[PDB]
Structure formats: C-alpha cells, structure tokens
C-alpha cells in the first residue's frame, strides 16, 4: 500500500524461487501468495481500496479453513491517502491534519483479523493475522497513526533507527516492544517447549539489567561495577550481537525455526548461569572470560548452524555445545 | 525525467538522472500549497508532499523487455542538517537508500564526507555477492558497519572517562575509527577505486581485530580472506 | 623432589565437591521442578 | 615426568558423569509426583 | 541527536530550560572545584617529593 | 592527601565531562524537540481556527 | 579515634630499635606486633607478601605501613597493585640501600601524573 | 447509565457501573463535531466536550431517600500517555479522582502498575479515619506519598550522580522506594488485601525510616503504631 514498485518486483522475482514444506512437498511459496500493489506514485485514493481488497481476500481464504496472514505495508500510507482526500474535501483536520474518523477506520480494519469458525458446513476453522507496517512521520512514534494502531493492535514490534544504522537487524527496540499474546501461548509452549517462557523472561531480565547498567556506565564508566554486573553487561552484549541480531539475507539466518531459537536461548542462558555461578564461587570475571573466550565464541557462533541440517542434527550439536560449555566452565574454575 | 524515460525506455539508453536541490522543489511545492490556502503539513509543507515526491522518485528503474534504465541521484539539502525534516524524511521513505554527506566529517577535513551509518542502499543486498562482486562483500560491509558504530560509541565513552579507562576492544575500535575515516572513507576527488580494491582496503581495517572479534563475518569467509594477507 | 603428585589431592577434592553437588543438585532441582508441577 | 596428574584429573570426568546421573535421578524422582498430581486430576 | 523521552508540553519546555540552566551552572561549579583541587594537587605532589 | 585528592579530581573531571558532553547536549536536544513539536501543535491549531 | 597504629616491616636494626624506642611494637590486645623480622634469606617472599596483606588488609587498626626496600623490591607487584588510602604504605631505605627515588610506588605514581 | 440509574434509584440497588473505553467515546464526539464543521477545541475536539463528558460522568452518586448508589469507573487510555491530552484533562476536571495506570511501572514488571503519585481520590479524606476505617489511615497515606516522592528524586540523583553523593535520608528513601513498589504496590491478581492488612504493610515500610523523619504523621499516631 503506497510503497515502492521495486518492493513488488523483488517479491515477484524471489517468491517463485522459494519453496515451502507445509503441504509435504517442495512447492514455490508464490503458489500460496497474492499481491495487492498500489505503488506510492499510483493513484492515492486507491490505497484505501487496496487495503480493503487485501483483508477481504484474506477473509475469503479464512472462510476455507486456512490460516492467512495479510501484510499491510504500509498502513500509514492509507492514512495519508485518507488525509489527502479529506484535505481536498475541506474537512476539519484532526491531529496532524488527519481526518477525525481515522482511528475508527483503523480499529474497524484491525477487527477483521482473528481466529474464526467458518460460516457454513462442514465445520472448519481459519484465521487472519494482520501485520501492518507503520511509517511514523520523522520516525516519531507520537504519530497519530502509530498512536491509534498501538491502541488497536496486540503486538508492538517497535524498531529503532539507531540499531538499523548500525546494521543491527532486526532493529526491534526491546525496551518499548511488547506482545500481549505471551500468556495465551503458554499452552503451546507447555506442549512443545515447556521452558520456553522461562528462558524468554530470563533473556528479557538480562537485557533490562544491562540497559540500566549501561545508563550507569555512560556517566560513571565501567568501574565500581561488581563482576556480576560485568557479566550481565557482557552477556547482554552477546545476546544483542548473536541472538537478537539475525541477518535475514544469509543461508543460515534467513529462517530460524522455533527449535533452533529455543536451543539458542538455552545456550545463551546457560552461558550466563555458568558465568554467574563461577564468579559467585570466587572466580574472577576478567580471568575467567580470558580463559573461556573459546566457549564464548562457540555460543556466539551457534547462530551459524544451518536449520536445513534438520532438527535432530542441530539439536545434537546444541547438546554438544552445552556439555562442552559446562566442562570448560568447570575446568576454568577448578 | 520525461526526457530520461524517453531515452531509457524508448531508445534503450542507460540514463543517470541528477536532480539537484529537491529541497527547492519542496519549497516551491510549499509556496503553491500556501497560495492554495491548504491545510499545511509538518513544518508547513503540504500533506501530499509524499505522493508528489513519489511521482518523481518512482520514475526510475528497469522494465521488462527494454535494455535501458534510469538511475536517479537526487541531491537534497537538509535544513539545519536535520534528517528528520519532512524533505529528507519523506525522500528516505520513497527512495531506495540515501548517501549521507555529514558536516562533522566535512569539518574534520575528510572527503568525501560520507557518513556511512545514516546511509543506506536498499538494493545492495541483491547487487553484491559471489557471482556479482566477490563473496566477502556483504559480510565485510556488515562488519565494517558494526565496528564503525562500536568505534563511535568508544569515542563518545572516551569523551567522558578518558582514554585510560577504555577496554582493549574499545581501543581497537578507536584505532579502526581513525584508520577507517582517514584511509578507507577518504579518497581523492578524482580517485576511482575498484570494489575489489576497496574490499582489500576493508579487510586490512578488519585485521586490526582478532578473527574471533569479527562476529558478523561467517566462518568460511573469515577462513578464506582473513589471513589472505 | 619436584615430583610429588599432589594433583591426586586435587582429584580427591574435586570428587568430594562433585558429591556435595549431587546433594544440592537433587534438592534444588527437585524442589524447583516440584513447585512448578504443583 | 608427572603426566600422572593429567590422568588423575579424571575427577572432572566423574563430576560430569555425577551431574548427568543427577539429571537422570531427578527425572525419576519427579515421576511419582507427576503421576500422582495427574491422578488427582483424573479423579 | 539523543534526547530524553518526554512528552512536549510548555510545562516540560520550561522544566527542561530550568534543567539546562542548572546543568550549565553546575558545570561551571564543578569546573571551579576541579581547578582548585588541581592546584592543591600540584602543591601536594611537589611537597611529597620534597 | 595525595591519594584522596587524586580520586576526587578524577571523579570531578569525569563528572564535568559527563555534564558537558552527555547531559547538556541531551537536554538541548530535548528542548529543541519540544519546541518543534509545540510549534507544530500551534500551527495545527492556528490553521484549524483559520479554516 | 578510629585508626592509629604504626606498622614496620624492617630488619632488626629498625623495627627493634630506632623508632621502637618511642613507637613500641605490640598491640593492646594482640600478639602479632604489627611487624615482621624479615630474616635475611630466611623469611619467604610469599610469607613477606602474606605479612603485607596481614598488615594492610587483614586488620584495620594499622594506620601506616613503614616498609624497608628489601621487602619492597621483591614485593614490588603486591605493593604496586595496592591502591587504597588508609594504610599509607611508606617505603624507607635500609642498611646500605638508599632511597632510589625511581622505584617506590607512590613516587612512581606522582611522576606518572603530572610530574 | 440509564439502566444503571434505573437499578440505582428506581429499584434502590447499590450498583457499580463502568464505562470502559470512555476515551473512545471522545473520538466519536470529535468525528460528529468535525462533520458539523463546529468551532473546535484543543486537538480538534468539540468545544463542548466538558459538558458532554460531564453529562456522563456526573450520572453517578447517591441521593437522599433511595438506598442505592452508582459507583462509576470509566476506563480511559491517554494518547501517548499524555495526561494533558484533552480527554484525560477534561475527565480529571469532572471526575472525583483518577487511578493512574503507569507504563514505567508496567515495563518494570509491577502489577498493578498503578503510579500513586498522579493518582487521586477526591472522596478519600472523608471516607477514612476514626471509627470508619482507622485512625492512622490519613497520616500513613500522606507519609507514604511524601516518602515515595522523595525516593523517586533520590533515584534520579543516584542515576546521574551515584549513591556516594546522596545523603543517608536519600538512601533510606531508595530502600523505601524498592519495597513500596515491589512488595506494597505489587500484588497478585485475585489477591484481596483488607484496608487493615494494607495499613499494617504501610507501617512496616515507614519503619524503614526513623520516628523523627516520619514528619507527616502527628505525634499521637506516630506513638501508637510506630512501635508495634
């Protein structure tokens, strides 16, 4: 919606060359995707239409018992189209020139997502997940579109430009980003990855502790910091560099299956726990880090495991990683 | 652009289009908007400036079955050096990247004063690589970006706690920062460097660090090109 | 001299520490996992 | 020649085995609890 | 550049102006303290050698 | 007298640098941002009233 | 008062005599005597460092350390690595060895900054 | 509010009526007002939004001869967490207090993430005291506000200056702030604390301080409850 024609060209060029296994055999993903393109230089008033087209198509497929994801890139462009039509109409401007009915339109559009039981028979269940990119003016999340959307949606993947300029991708701002589905997902994890939420919370706690320690350091420097604080900062840097940072245009990190993600969380939190345990038992963090740089490098390089190698093989090597890390942390601390 | 579209798509030429000072175009657009008695947008520019700029920038690229192209390079003055101004902000949402000329680098005597951190090429991920440039290119650019950002952070840290308090990695990043800015970024106004010459200059900067600190370069690329010499 | 194998003492100490580990490694883990189950 | 210390350092190997033998042992001890707590639910 | 995440209001504008004035004059205060302590440090380093 | 004074001067110089390089620029950026946003709100209200 | 004791790491010619005539050698309720004989070639260097830790960190009453160069040169790393304020370690010449103003930690620091 | 009123006075039923997303109603009022091309207020909202929100908020209360009441808890989401926004602003000028749900406390893991400092109850002064809640309820509340406002300024001085240059009272206030938020304001869902348990826990947190700096408690109350 109101975005580059080149972005539609690359989708059309790439999707035919990408294959999925959802049906049991390799088949181009283009076979199960539809595109609705209203480039930024196409008629502005059509942007709204495109959005309403997309969701409808999505809903249609949800009526067939399929799980559809409709991607609105970008909804800010639809809001801008509404603003332009409103300006040509001489209507009273709301915040930042937008029409007073923008928030209601966004809320109604987002209410069309959901898991549902199809209308007719035989009974079948589908879902529509709306994923909408928001383009705040100036990068400021005070934008009316962002303010309405965050009021509507349940997941907030907020991106940081200072991370993107650094090539830290995805540039999710972990401080502001939130998901309100973490509670309903417990069931899933309890059936598949039972200690997934615990590790997620451990990672978030480590990241928050590091964020505050870094505010302290920026003014006071990395001195008067307990070795535990040094470990927290070091492992948060490790997580940010090698877990939260995923190169989407590589053969290994284009896709990270949930099991590889879970094993990587296990490895990073195991590193943190081993370091904390070793230092708490009299070990010195500087010397211990010098001695276990090899373990640190193995944990960081865990991201290079090819998911195409299979769940069993990757899990086996992650278990080898964990055992080697335990052995080395025992060796380096007597 | 109408001329370019004629040369490129009807005569099969490859056109490079320079559009100098799109900021003055935005000023003229704002002037017309003000005469129209329109509801002004952010900092007074029209609310439709995004679409109006898109109708200019989106007139570029390649089309099927025609052996011409249009490569646009608009030149855009940022008011008060502020990248969040509507002109640069909207231009960056419409365009496929930006080359950021920095005043801080210009004052420091560097030319070209291009600050790579605020810069982007959205079509680089596909234009570079094994069969197109060399297979080190994407890893070597990502690592350069990461180390440059770390060096900026270390310089800011040194501004407060002094050089003595910095870690070893931070001092390596400072060394990288000075050498990167004064050797790899600095080029003659008439000097042309091949991408293979520039990727040989990039590896020399990345050799300031232990191979195990190059965490963004894949292990196979770091085996083939790190020790190379 | 300089041939005394007091590394045997270190091995014995490591074994003793590995036993005391079993202690807190069946009392910590079981307690936490039982609390989770409950 | 004091390489006998390196071999005698197998206390580390025993420690690793003791820790694997405590993960196994915890797996067995949590059993009775899990079956009991699910049997109350079954009732 | 980097800025505090606060919502723009005239009250916040005045609060930040007051904070900036306080920062400037506290900076001058700590500068003077540093110069005094540095002079005394010169003296102590001479007398300690003596 | 030397040890304590050296510590105190190190801390004071670090804090002076923190004030003049981290806190003051950050506060100035915040002031500029707030001024720009308030000017934007004023422009919006003025032009809505004019309409 | 909180910290008043004088501590002397010196040969018998200094700790036993000289200042000991007016400084004493024993604590009000201790037998450590805040001193080390430091027999020439008898006291271990490791034991010398242990005594330095004893009189600098293990007990708090010691207000000053007064250490001879003989131990200090061999104990160089330990005393150089000590950066606290209260024990105010003070190097002294002993026997024939003079001050050597290019060796002791505090004056090294002073020349390091600013002169 | 006409169904709640009918139960409250017509059937004499004590009722608690909540107008969830009252903040959303303001958007509809602005949409209608803009369609009418009326003269707008702040942010484009109708100039009569205080009279339209007061015809909803003031339909609560008790009346003389009827043994029923309407307790109203509108829920209102402040845009950008801005309390100076017209909706929360005009609700604050019409309502008898506000429970302020805070995003800094929420991100910090606390539930309920209620920041008591922006919060207020206009009817608390008269609802608490001798013979109807307890005698220490007002003094304890005021002292807790005083100590929380001082712990939050001790924590800003420690963020820029560190602990080594904040007084002993500031350290006590930092300790008070940690236990206030993590033990008193923090509370599980389905955890029902009685006003008396909550006062006892407040007394346990104000004992952090010495009897002499609890200066917002009168000597009579400071005497009976400070030493239990």
Curated annotation (Swiss-Prot), chain A:
Organism: Saccharomyces cerevisiae (strain ATCC 204508 / S288c)
Domain of life: Eukaryota
Boundaries of the shown chain within the full protein: 738 to 1071 of 1071
Descriptive protein name: V-type proton ATPase catalytic subunit A, 2nd part
Modified residue annotations for Phosphoserine: 121, 191
Region forming the signal peptide: none
Curated annotation (Swiss-Prot), chain C:
Top-level lineage group: Eukaryota
Region annotation (Interaction with VMA10) ranges: 1-17
Annotated coiled-coil segments of the chain: 1-24
Membrane-spanning intervals of the chain: none
Record's subcellular location: Vacuole membrane
Intrachain disulfide bonds: none
Remarks, miscellaneous: Present with 16134 molecules/cell in log phase SD medium.
Subunit structure and binding partners: Homodimer. V-ATPase is a heteromultimeric enzyme composed of a peripheral catalytic V1 complex (components A to H) attached to an integral membrane V0 proton pore complex (components: a, c, c', c'', d, e, f and VOA1). Interacts with VMA5; the interaction is direct. Interacts with VMA10; the interaction is direct. Interacts with RAV1 and RAV2 components of the RAVE complex, which are essential for the stability and assembly of V-ATPase.
Function noted in UniProt: Subunit of the V1 complex of vacuolar(H+)-ATPase (V-ATPase), a multisubunit enzyme composed of a peripheral complex (V1) that hydrolyzes ATP and a membrane integral complex (V0) that translocates protons. V-ATPase is responsible for acidifying and maintaining the pH of intracellular compartments.
UniProt similarity note: Belongs to the V-ATPase E subunit family.
Name of the protein described by the UniProt record: V-type proton ATPase subunit E
Species whose genome carries this gene: Saccharomyces cerevisiae (strain ATCC 204508 / S288c)
Originating gene: VMA4
Curated annotation (Swiss-Prot), chain F:
Domain of life assignment: Eukaryota
Coiled-coil residue windows: none
Subcellular location: Vacuole membrane
Quaternary data: V-ATPase is a heteromultimeric enzyme composed of a peripheral catalytic V1 complex (components A to H) attached to an integral membrane V0 proton pore complex (components: a, c, c', c'', d, e, f and VOA1). Interacts with RAV1 and RAV2 components of the RAVE complex, which are essential for the stability and assembly of V-ATPase.
Membership in a protein family: Belongs to the V-ATPase D subunit family.
Miscellaneous information on this protein: Present with 8500 molecules/cell in log phase SD medium.
Protein role: Subunit of the V1 complex of vacuolar(H+)-ATPase (V-ATPase), a multisubunit enzyme composed of a peripheral complex (V1) that hydrolyzes ATP and a membrane integral complex (V0) that translocates protons. V-ATPase is responsible for acidifying and maintaining the pH of intracellular compartments.
Protein name (Swiss-Prot/TrEMBL): V-type proton ATPase subunit D
Species name: Saccharomyces cerevisiae (strain ATCC 204508 / S288c)
Full protein: residues contained: 155 to 205 of 256
Curated annotation (Swiss-Prot), chain G:
Subcellular location field: Vacuole membrane
InterPro entries in the record: ATPase_V1-cplx_f_g_su, ATPase_V1-cplx_fsu_euk, ATPase_V1_fsu_sf
Disulfide bond positions: none
Broad class of where this protein is predominantly found: membrane
GO biological process, one term: Golgi lumen acidification
Topological relation to the membrane, as annotated: Peripheral membrane protein
Keywords noted in UniProt: Hydrogen ion transport, Ion transport, Membrane, Transport, Vacuole
Molecular function as annotated in GO: proton-transporting ATPase activity, rotational mechanism
Additional free-text comment from the UniProt record: Present with 4050 molecules/cell in log phase SD medium.
Quaternary structure annotation from Swiss-Prot or TrEMBL: V-ATPase is a heteromultimeric enzyme composed of a peripheral catalytic V1 complex (components A to H) attached to an integral membrane V0 proton pore complex (components: a, c, c', c'', d, e, f and VOA1).
Function: Subunit of the V1 complex of vacuolar(H+)-ATPase (V-ATPase), a multisubunit enzyme composed of a peripheral complex (V1) that hydrolyzes ATP and a membrane integral complex (V0) that translocates protons. V-ATPase is responsible for acidifying and maintaining the pH of intracellular compartments.
Record's protein name: V-type proton ATPase subunit F
Species of the source: Saccharomyces cerevisiae (strain ATCC 204508 / S288c)
